[PDB]
Amino acid sequence: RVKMHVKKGDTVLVASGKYKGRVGKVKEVLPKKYAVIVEGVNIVKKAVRVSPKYPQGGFIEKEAPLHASKVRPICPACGKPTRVRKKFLENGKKIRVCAKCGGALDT
Amino acid sequence: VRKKGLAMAVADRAREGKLLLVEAFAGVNGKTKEFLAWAKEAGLDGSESVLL
Amino acid sequence: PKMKTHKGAKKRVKITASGKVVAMKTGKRHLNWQKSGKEIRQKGRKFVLAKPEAERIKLLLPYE
RNA sequence: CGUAAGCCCAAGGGUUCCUACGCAAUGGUCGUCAGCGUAGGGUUAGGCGGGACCUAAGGUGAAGCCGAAAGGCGUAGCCGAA
RNA sequence: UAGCGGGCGUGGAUCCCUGGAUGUCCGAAUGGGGGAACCCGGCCGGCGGGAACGCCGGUCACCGCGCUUUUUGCGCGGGGGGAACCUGGGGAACUGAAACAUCUCAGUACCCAGAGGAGAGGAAAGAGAAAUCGACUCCCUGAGUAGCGGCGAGCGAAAGGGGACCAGCCUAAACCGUCCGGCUUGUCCGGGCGGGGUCGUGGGGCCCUCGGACACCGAAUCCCCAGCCUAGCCGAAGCUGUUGGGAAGCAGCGCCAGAGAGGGUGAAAGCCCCGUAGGCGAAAGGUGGGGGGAUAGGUGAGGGUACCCGAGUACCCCGUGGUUCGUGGAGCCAUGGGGGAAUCUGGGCGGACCACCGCCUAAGGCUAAGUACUCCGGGUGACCGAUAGCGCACCAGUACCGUGAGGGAAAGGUGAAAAGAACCCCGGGAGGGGAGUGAAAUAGAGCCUGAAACCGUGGGCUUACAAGCAGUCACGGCCCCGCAAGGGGUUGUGGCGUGCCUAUUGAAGCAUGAGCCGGCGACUCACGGUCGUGGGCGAGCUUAAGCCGUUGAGGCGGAGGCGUAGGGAAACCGAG
């Protein structure tokens, strides 16, 4: 329900601070808690070495989430904002004085 | 009483001379731009105020 | 809200145009027979003063 | 102790029962123990009890009779017990 | 909110919006019963081998209105809720009068009944004095005036003037007919229907003559549509350096604006995000007199007749209520017992009563709006900040208490992020101690910021021949900063000294209240007065409701108030 923010499902930069000015993967969005995960927040998590899912010293982590509005879209340019447009056959949403958004599927 | 106020208000302003009475304007249409330019033409820099 | 203005107050006394409460002499309805006409003549009017100030507060709204 | 302090019934309480694990809190101290926490489990009916049987004081209540109202009384009928 | 886990989607899902289906047992409860949420039966279709027993579906409550062959069914409606507000029938007491009866609180609290986005009210048998008015209701006004009153406490009108909205209608009667019923056939006693008719310088009826029409007026009712809310969609501008865990901050150079409201982003931004102003959007649903079509409907002038115009009535008595009228010289309005009429020479009324003069047509029923309320949807606040604010921010009408009615809490903050601590070590665990997580672990998990009492580890000073509201003055020593000269903490001696509050004729009192600390907790406001003051005007001065406007914008509005003369109880006179 009108839960429309910004970030979607392409690949894009970091404008926060931890790893500001960096870039990462598809971005696997989750969820309404305004969290997005490119590759940014990487940590090293404990998890008891319990012989099941953990060897003789589990202590590993990878993708830890990070807030949405702390990232930004980049077009073949630098990193400028977005903007929509109706194709009279779909819904395109390019970039500030640029073309294309997240519609390389035929959009 | 309050009417004096009205009068006296402007009166003080007029006692200073900060009131312009242009018949119309040069920034006729609705644009921040043209009013800004006209504000150069009136010299109303960027450190004043408009009960306008 | 709004003062009640006393009915009796106006009903028996008047404050003259001076903030001076003036009206009635007391004592004539059972007097008589052995009454000298001297006092019946002096039972004409009176004057009142002092506490009559509070009496001016009584009437209030219409004054009178 | 043993006309009980032992053993049945009944109203009551609402899973305290059995079994395993376990003590930080509940036991006027402890506590490896429990009417304590926790999980799996246990309550079987044509003849016992009770209704698809009966009436009691009483309740109820078409009709009736009455009351400013809400209601009050109330026949037949229906509810009512260990 | 995860977790053993397993699906799901651009052949467009979760998701919100509308419409339908679906909804087991209770609850007015409705087959009947009943200790609500459970039990039992009839009656048509069915299910199982299915008559034994079972289930499922349909259907079975009374109340009222109109029909229907009174017989039997159908027919439209009824029952319960609701935060406040509303109409009616009931209705107090404290308390005010410094006591108490009249009076008062008060026709308020509550009891009940009923109607709804409203109510009730509402077409004058009125008003009031002018030959002036013209449905009902709300705000201002008049006015705390007119009066009511143990003439006490106090209670408190209407007309008029200003705004608010603005609506006016239909039956019974006389005339005439159609069906039915009875009947002392009779120019016939009633019920239904049918046209007829609705008024106050009187209307209606009948005959009759002026002349009566294609017309004039137009609904409160049904339809058409703009519109309004139930999902939404668009939306203008940024980049390097730099300290810092963190940049948005500070530096440099801009950009946008009909949009620099605000929230968020690891700090404090119009340009990073959601937004902003500005401007668009509904298949279905609701809503809709905002703008439109039509239907039911409504419009005459004269002459005589004397047919009609609301009956247990009007009026009279008795016993009342209401009005400001407490019985007053006591009317008007409505009504409980009895007495008991007229249709326009009948009549009710202008406050006993009468002459007169004006006003109004009762004894039948409907009517939007202007007003009110706040469960609810939005906005807004010189509103509160987790003892405050709804009683509750949080798992509250929950714990708990009570037979029941009912009472009624306590409890919010880790961090930007869970990264919420793997390993080892002591340890039975409980909890710690290195490591590691982050800016910070002085953020370690009821953890922000942790104050006060409060217990305690260590250190400095002094205390075992002393009699004390616990301090103050000075001297002195002991311990620590200071360049010196000065400062600090402590206490050996001695000069001195009856805690605090309240309450008193008077307290240290053997009067009074406080264990300690923490939070809360007590001179407000609205209206009318009276006085002083800072002001504007000033022989005048100022508007109330409301109209228009504005989003934190004012103006318009002279109705009304105080002022100019007072004196007398009054007529009435007048600087007397």
Side-chain angles (χ1 to χ4, degrees):
Chain A
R1 228 319 134 264
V2 230
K3 30 76 176 182
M4 232 73 265
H5 42 18
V6 243
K7 292 89 208 176
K8 37 184 306 91
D10 44 8
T11 289
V12 104
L13 75 100
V14 182
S16 71
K18 219 301 109 190
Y19 274 91
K20 198 259 164 287
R22 302 288 308 279
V23 284
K25 235 181 196 176
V26 172
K27 201 252 302 171
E28 307 84 283
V29 202
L30 181 281
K32 75 206 84 60
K33 266 194 174 184
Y34 232 3
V36 298
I37 174 61
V38 266
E39 309 283 31
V41 179
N42 55 288
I43 338 193
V44 36
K45 207 213 61 176
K46 279 93 272 142
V48 191
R49 42 50 55 193
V50 186
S51 185
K53 194 206 153 294
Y54 313 97
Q56 202 166 322
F59 198 64
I60 183 62
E61 202 265 339
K62 36 170 193 183
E63 318 157 282
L66 195 60
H67 181 280
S69 306
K70 284 198 292 186
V71 287
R72 289 195 59 184
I74 172 192
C75 205
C78 57
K80 262 187 287 179
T82 44
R83 49 177 46 260
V84 316
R85 186 177 287 176
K86 299 171 297 186
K87 264 68 227 168
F88 265 51
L89 42 96
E90 212 167 316
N91 264 9
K93 52 173 186 183
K94 301 170 161 185
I95 283 281
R96 216 57 210 77
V97 199
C98 267
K100 188 164 181 169
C101 55
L105 301 178
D106 220 84
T107 312
Chain B
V1 163
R2 121 256 307 204
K3 263 333 183 185
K4 270 186 145 196
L6 235 96
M8 197 157 303
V10 77
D12 208 42
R13 211 59 55 175
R15 178 77 74 75
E16 303 162 324
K18 306 292 175 176
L19 59 162
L20 175 61
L21 339 177
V22 265
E23 187 193 352
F25 297 93
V28 248
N29 300 79
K31 208 61 204 173
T32 24
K33 304 291 194 173
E34 41 187 331
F35 177 70
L36 265 35
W38 192 79
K40 213 297 177 178
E41 285 291 75
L44 316 174
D45 35 70
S47 175
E48 311 296 306
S49 39
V50 233
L51 177 90
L52 144 44
Chain C
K2 265 205 176 185
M3 286 297 228
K4 267 287 153 157
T5 156
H6 190 215
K7 283 272 156 172
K10 311 170 58 174
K11 252 173 182 164
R12 46 191 110 181
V13 66
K14 200 266 185 185
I15 65 111
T16 75
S18 50
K20 285 203 164 193
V21 204
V22 176
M24 211 45 67
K25 244 291 166 195
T26 66
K28 194 271 214 194
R29 216 65 108 172
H30 311 327
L31 234 318
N32 325 83
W33 97 100
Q34 189 44 73
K35 229 308 115 269
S36 63
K38 203 173 159 193
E39 227 283 84
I40 297 170
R41 233 171 298 112
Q42 290 174 331
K43 195 63 214 304
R45 214 219 199 171
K46 207 224 184 318
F47 174 70
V48 233
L49 64 172
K51 288 96 96 59
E53 168 70 25
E55 210 77 18
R56 293 191 324 186
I57 316 190
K58 252 75 85 187
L59 36 88
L60 231 53
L61 287 144
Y63 230 175
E64 321 276 330

